[PDB]
Amino acid sequence: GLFGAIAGFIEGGWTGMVDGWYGYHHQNEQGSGYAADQKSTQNAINGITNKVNSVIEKMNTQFTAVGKEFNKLERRMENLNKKVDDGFLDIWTYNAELLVLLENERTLDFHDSNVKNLYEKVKSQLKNNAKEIGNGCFEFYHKCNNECMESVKNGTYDYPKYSEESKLNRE
Amino acid sequence: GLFGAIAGFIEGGWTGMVDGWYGYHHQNEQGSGYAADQKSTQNAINGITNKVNSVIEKMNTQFTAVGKEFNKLERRMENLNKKVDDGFLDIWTYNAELLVLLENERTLDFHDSNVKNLYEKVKSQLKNNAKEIGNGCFEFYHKCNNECMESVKNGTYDYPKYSEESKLNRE
Amino acid sequence: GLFGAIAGFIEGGWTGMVDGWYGYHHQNEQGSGYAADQKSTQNAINGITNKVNSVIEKMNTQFTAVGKEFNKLERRMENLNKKVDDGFLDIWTYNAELLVLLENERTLDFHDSNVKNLYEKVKSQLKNNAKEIGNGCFEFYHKCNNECMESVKNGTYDYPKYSEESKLNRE
Amino acid sequence: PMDECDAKCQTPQGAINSSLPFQNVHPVTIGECPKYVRSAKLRMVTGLRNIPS
Amino acid sequence: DTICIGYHANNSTDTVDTVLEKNVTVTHSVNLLEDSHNGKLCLLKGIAPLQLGNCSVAGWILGNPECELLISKESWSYIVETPNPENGTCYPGYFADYEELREQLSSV
Ligand SMILES: *[C@@H]1O[C@H](CO)[C@@H](O)[C@H](O)[C@H]1NC(C)=O
Ligand SMILES: *[C@@H]1O[C@H](CO)[C@@H](O)[C@H](O)[C@H]1NC(C)=O
Ligand SMILES: *[C@@H]1O[C@H](CO)[C@@H](O)[C@H](O)[C@H]1NC(C)=O
């Protein structure tokens, strides 16, 4: 995509994360593991579900239509009937394939932005209390226990609270 | 949108701003208020106006077309005439609705980027002379009078000029 | 575009760069010049080439189709034949023009992001060993010879190696 | 052949039991049918790019 | 202590096309195109078709002697005709407006 998160700053996805699309991984003295960001994932799902259903639901049902018999002196009309069917088939095939390709590209950019935005949310929370490393990770300069990890994920990190410790650990 | 400004870093819009779409709000010892960014707003308007007019102007006028009478032994032709009209109606309805939905989504991303870019323009001007706070605001570390506020808005902020004052105020 | 690189942070392009689309310019004691980023350029080319070919290749060949003769008592059928041709022409003209306009806009955003991402790649490599200046340039705080310039371009810059020198040069 | 079955869409090649917007089975149909296209596949992505690491 | 941001991955081989890339493996996808059928002639919402067997529409509607099995067939959902019916106008002649009659009977 155009935001550069998927197989970009993030080396690749997590096969160990099973409760969502976007999320976090953590490690501290009390344990480690993966957890999904339910708010980000559900919003991504609702957007995509509406997009898929829009493409399908806006299409009308194909109503009964069959070919027509023509006699041997009605070739001009038979050829007109065929022209109409071929023209409609060509229009719908071109549009169906091109629409899907255009929308698949946009879906992947949608996802690329959503994970990048999650990354920035944390960067803005942590400020100088952690450093950026590759693979989309923030390495803390202070002890961050399980209560801290939940606080960072929820967007409630009390930045100044940990600033004295990080200033010392940063040397 | 995918840039995250609208009801994102910016809590919501300003009902007190009436001279444009994008803009600034300020407060200092000499006063406070709202003012639009006329360059950003006008470019956004021109882009959108061209988009709307393109959708309308590229459409051809519907020229006179009426149904046709057929006699009782011309049902195959009556049904062909109907098939042609229903097919064209189905194609244009699907395309008209889907086009509008796709373009409305893009318009909102257009706007989301334009306000985010305005935010970054100021961040790059202020550097270390102000801090980022929530709601898309920069809190200055030095006195910034009305001449300063105009300078920041115009992209002419003389950064080093205020650096000694901000270094002291930053502690 | 919506990323703001083209005639944005970059004042304009380089007529002196001839080996690609995206790239670098450098100056140090051993020389100066332009060089393209072959990985970025080739990926941009492959993406665009696939897009152009998709628009063309998904179109079917126009197969022989000519008008039809009708006699003077077949005006209703002549008018139906014409209606079918005019309807198909109107659909394909509208779609062809609108598709090209929509895709040209997306191509320019594609390119705007690709150069911006290249800019960020370097910013992340250099960290505190260089400062951002206008026109998309990084001014180094340490001597950066030709081996250094290749290292930065390749994404292999050994940041801490130059940190003592830059700390002193930064005052 | 005719058999003891029911469908909302029937083509000359056999009945269709599906809710998708398009089909590539046959252009001539009776009932409430998916629209006929010449496409081999129309697959849309809903998930993420599947690149683990 | 570390916090990392990433995204989901799995064992999926679902592959989609885009305008910039031609074979993209994704974790989840939706098929918008139906390519199967059951090979059978079914009832439509409970109503069986009229099977003409070896009879053409002309054979049926005129009472061809070999189409006797189609006499009691008072109602149907659609009409099914074999590709090359053999029992039609048993006494040869021109059937006027035949195609037009078929178009109108098909709606009955
Ligand atoms: C993925 O693994 C699960 C078992 O954990 C299995 O049921 C599923 O079929 C596998 N999917 C693919 C695409 O191989
Ligand atoms: C994409 O995959 C299909 C098999 O599903 C293969 O036939 C085709 O050549 C591949 N193509 C490209 C253009 O990468
Ligand atoms: C229809 O044709 C087949 C093949 O010649 C024959 O076996 C069958 O008896 C004919 N039909 C009827 C309805 O009697």
Author numbering:
A (entry chain B), B (entry chain I), C (entry chain D): 1 to 171
D (entry chain A): 273 to 325
E (entry chain A): 11 to 54, 54A, 55 to 83, 83A, 84 to 95, 95A, 96 to 115
Give sentences from the paper:
Influenza A viruses are categorized by their surface glycoproteins including hemagglutinin (HA), which binds sialic acid receptors on the surface of a host cell and mediates fusion of the virus with the host endosomal membrane. While only the H1N1 and H3N2 influenza A subtypes currently circulate in humans, the H2N2 influenza virus poses a distinct risk. A recent phase 1 clinical trial investigating a ferritin nanoparticle vaccine displaying H2 hemagglutinin (HA) in H2-naive and H2-exposed adults enabled us to perform comprehensive structural and biochemical characterization of immune memory on the breadth and diversity of the polyclonal serum antibody response elicited. The molecular details of cross-reactive and strain-specific monoclonal antibodies (mAbs) isolated from H2-F-vaccinated individuals were revealed by high-resolution cryoelectron microscopy (cryo-EM).
We found that the H2-naive individuals likely recalled cross-reactive pAb responses from pre-existing immunity to H1N1 viruses. For H2-naive individuals, we observed through semi-quantitative nsEMPEM and serological analyses that the vast majority of H2-specific pAb responses targeted the conserved stem domain, and H1 cross-reactive RBS responses were also recalled. To assess epitopes targeted by cross-reactive and H2-specific head-binding antibodies, mAbs from B cells collected post-vaccination were isolated and characterized from six participants from blood collected 1 and 2 weeks after H2-F boost. nsEM epitope mapping revealed distinct patterns for each mAb group: H2-specific mAbs targeted a variety of epitopes on the HA head including RBS, vestigial esterase, and antigenic sites Sa and Cb, while the majority of cross-reactive mAbs targeted the RBS. These cross-reactive RBS antibodies were detected in three subjects (1-1, 1-3, and 2-2), demonstrating that this broad antibody response is seen across individuals after H2 vaccination. Moreover, multiple cross-reactive mAbs targeted the RBS with similar mechanisms to known RBS-targeting mAbs, suggesting that H2 vaccination offers a broad scope of protection by generating multiple modes of binding to the RBS. The DNA plasmid and H2-F vaccines induced cross-reactive antibodies to the RBS in multiple participants that circulated as pAbs in serum.
